Design an enzyme around this catalytic site. Sequence first.
Site, PDB file in Angstrom:
ATOM      1  N   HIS A 297     -10.225 -36.446 -51.704  1.00 39.95           N
ATOM      2  CA  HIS A 297     -11.771 -36.216 -52.553  1.00 39.95           C
ATOM      3  C   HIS A 297     -12.402 -38.072 -51.257  1.00 39.95           C
ATOM      4  CE1 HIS A 297     -15.283 -37.525 -54.632  1.00 39.95           C
ATOM      5  NE2 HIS A 297     -15.462 -36.446 -53.802  1.00 39.95           N
TER       6      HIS A 297
ATOM      7  N   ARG B  41     -15.048 -36.121 -61.539  1.00 45.36           N
ATOM      8  CA  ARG B  41     -14.849 -37.549 -62.058  1.00 45.36           C
ATOM      9  C   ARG B  41     -14.014 -37.949 -63.467  1.00 45.36           C
ATOM     10  NH1 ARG B  41     -13.439 -42.186 -63.641  1.00 45.36           N
ATOM     11  NH2 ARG B  41     -15.293 -43.640 -62.769  1.00 45.36           N
TER      12      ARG B  41
ATOM     13  N   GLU C  41     -28.462 -27.097 -63.258  1.00 46.98           N
ATOM     14  CA  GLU C  41     -27.866 -25.811 -62.980  1.00 46.98           C
ATOM     15  C   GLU C  41     -29.042 -24.931 -64.254  1.00 46.98           C
ATOM     16  OE1 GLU C  41     -26.098 -27.998 -62.483  1.00 46.98           O
ATOM     17  OE2 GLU C  41     -26.649 -28.282 -60.171  1.00 46.98           O
TER      18      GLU C  41
ATOM     19  N   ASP D 216     -29.111 -21.601 -58.930  1.00 46.03           N
ATOM     20  CA  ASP D 216     -28.713 -21.971 -59.736  1.00 46.03           C
ATOM     21  C   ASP D 216     -29.555 -23.707 -58.937  1.00 46.03           C
ATOM     22  OD1 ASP D 216     -26.244 -23.284 -59.019  1.00 46.03           O
ATOM     23  OD2 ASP D 216     -25.522 -22.981 -60.960  1.00 46.03           O
TER      24      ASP D 216
ATOM     25  N   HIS E  69     -12.013 -32.754 -57.633  1.00 47.16           N
ATOM     26  CA  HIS E  69     -12.939 -33.797 -57.116  1.00 47.16           C
ATOM     27  C   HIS E  69     -13.665 -34.418 -58.477  1.00 47.16           C
ATOM     28  CE1 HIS E  69     -11.847 -31.948 -53.905  1.00 47.16           C
ATOM     29  NE2 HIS E  69     -12.074 -31.140 -54.152  1.00 47.16           N
TER      30      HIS E  69
ATOM     31  N   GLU F 191     -28.217 -13.221 -57.535  1.00 44.42           N
ATOM     32  CA  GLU F 191     -27.366 -13.853 -58.442  1.00 44.42           C
ATOM     33  C   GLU F 191     -28.466 -14.968 -59.329  1.00 44.42           C
ATOM     34  OE1 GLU F 191     -23.356 -16.812 -58.153  1.00 44.42           O
ATOM     35  OE2 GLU F 191     -25.157 -17.633 -58.673  1.00 44.42           O
TER      36      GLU F 191
END
Lengths: 357, 349
Positions: free
Chosen positions: B221, B190, B122, B86, B188, B108
């Site tokens: 991270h 936000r 994506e 994607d 990770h 895919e």
Amino acid sequence: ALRVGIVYGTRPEAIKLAPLVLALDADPGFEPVIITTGDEINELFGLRPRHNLDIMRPGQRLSAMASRIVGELGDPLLDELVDVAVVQGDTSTAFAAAYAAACERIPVAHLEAGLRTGDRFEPFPEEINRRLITQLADLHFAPTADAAGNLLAEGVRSDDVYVTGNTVIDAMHLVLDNRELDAFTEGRQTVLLTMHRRESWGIPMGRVAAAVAELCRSRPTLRFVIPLHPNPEVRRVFRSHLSSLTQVLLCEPLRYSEFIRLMHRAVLVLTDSGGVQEEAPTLGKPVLVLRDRTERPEGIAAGCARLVGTDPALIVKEVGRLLDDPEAYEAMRRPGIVCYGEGDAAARCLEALRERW
Amino acid sequence: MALRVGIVYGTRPEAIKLAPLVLALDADPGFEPVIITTGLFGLRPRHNLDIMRPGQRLSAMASRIVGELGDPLLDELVDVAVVQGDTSTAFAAAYAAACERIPVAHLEAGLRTGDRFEPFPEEINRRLITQLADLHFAPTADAAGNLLAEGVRSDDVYVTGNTVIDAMHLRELDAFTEGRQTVLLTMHRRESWGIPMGRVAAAVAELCRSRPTLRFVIPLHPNPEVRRVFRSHLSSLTQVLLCEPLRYSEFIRLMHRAVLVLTDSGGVQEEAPTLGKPVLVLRDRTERPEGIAAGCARLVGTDPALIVKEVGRLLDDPEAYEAMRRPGIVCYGEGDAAARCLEALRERW
Ligand code: NA
Ligand code: NA
């Protein structure tokens, strides 16, 4: 006020967008902002571009055009605080512009959405452009119920599709509000014959030239206007065949206003132009297509257009039928308007925009 | 002259899923793979366009790829171009190939969240690539179904399965993990930063206090606000290793050793169940709902009581562990997918 981006690169885009631009100007809810990627036509409709990027050239690689538009259109869209971007038709501008708008998360509306030949990469790249633009657009202005149907088959939500109709009838009325062209045609049944495609050059043009000669010899009341190609080697054929016939006017390439004025006066239209296959039936003109295929098969299905190729016997026969059988003429005239969509389409675009935003 | 197959990627996850197809295209005498990149397996790039950068405008990336990929595809006489997933590379590459009239195959193909512009870009990329591609390698029957709803001809869609299982098979945290049940925790996102990370930190503390035999590895991270919370809560615990971001080989090795995986990564939600690892998803939603349906994944959010409960069940009920382990491994498509891609290529061309 909703700031509406209007992006085009070519004359046909500008012609179909102009009535939407004018309507967006007049309405106090919207502010149109024209960015071009490609002047005569700007002056004719009163289009004042805010940005001219100057990307497009003749014989430029598609990849080069797409790259420059995808790379450069974002910044002016952001600087002008555009809320929605409108693109038109199946052009590489319309696709590249729509991707550029989507990169900045600017919603895209598509004028004349949902037309499908059902023939992958024919024409190229128009057919893939249509399908790419359809995935990028939030709002779809379909010219007909059939076009709307095609958008649903590609996963578009019903609430995003409006049957708006086609702006081209409104653009042609706007230019409808000349030297000999008026004198030559007045009182007579006049055929408009435009033949310009590269595959039409040489032998096929001669075959069409012979058909015109035959028809002129049989039908003394019949007249033809034939705009000559700007390439001297090409315009040589029609001159060598038709210059001595009093029933045939060979003229210089026409400006858009003179051209559609002439097309309005004509009794029928012989063309290898996809544009003219749309414009002529919209002004009620039966169309014979000087090709064995078309990019506008809708007109063949509705029966306002007919494939005649460059076969002189068929051209003579087919022109005859229409001049002599008023039944035959009407069976091509009636379906012609409403084939490429109803008029007053700009107003229907504004309603859909006022509803969503 | 073999059928010359263009392989275009810009990122690690593309390269990982393409590698088994590349290796299979090498081995088979009917094809010749030609790798062009835009950004361990034995991949030999013929052209490396250093287009992609961190924090570059999408429009700038797309423009460079659309402008520059054609020439190398033509120079290398590529017959078909393969793109993966994607990515903006996969879309830009596919458009570039189509401009030179080179057919595109999509590895895919057909995954749809049903959530427009989420994630961005994506979701739009998937739909654009789908319109450009002549051949579609769908990982599942459901994916194939999604391509038909967008007007793709049945003739162009092959259920090939997923190459990722095949790609995965190809010191101090070894000491820490050896002999122990180890939980891998990657976090990770936000929306997870600050308070929710503390809630996850508290769950780890509770579990560590109740189960002295249990261990956790937590890669930190590169965002200091993320490191601050985990440090303040977990640095004092002997049963918790806080480490730097892992290299891919060590990461997959660790994930293979782990007893279960806690993650807010969509990638890890795919990879972990494919290695037979039950996954607790540190989110209230997922872009991998197939794992929730198969029961190889479970939404746990950042709720400390639920994390404790859910980790407990799996550590104590070997029946419960297997009921999440079994439906993994073939949840995201069958393996041996490369061979199925070659067959489809040999059939069409
Ligand atoms: Na206005
Ligand atoms: Na080979």
